[PDB]
Amino acid sequence: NNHPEVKIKTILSLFLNINIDDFNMDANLADAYDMDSTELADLAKEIEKEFGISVTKSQFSHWETGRAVLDFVSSSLND
């Protein structure tokens, strides 16, 4: 539940096959890391598994950057 930035940075780095200290949390995922629709859906399934939360397609469509994923997950865990 705590240090959620480091966990999300780690998850996104592993998912996108990027070195952890090369990952930019404020970069557009589609532009910086060539994220497509299929991958974003797959990322959501990993987030669901790793944190034990639910994610609709409407919710994860707004995951434009790593920071959007972080802030969604943080508020989802507070609920």
Q: What's the per-residue H, E or C state across 34-47?
A: CCCHHHHHHHHHHH
Residues 75, 77, 78, 79, Cα dihedral to 10°: 90
Contact of 73 with 47, CB cutoff 8 Å: yes
| Number of other CB atoms surrounding residue 66 within 10 Å | 24
Taking 3-state DSSP, the helix, strand and coil percentages for the chain, each rounded to the nearest 5, stand at 65, 5, 30
Task: State the structure-solving technique.
Answer: X-ray
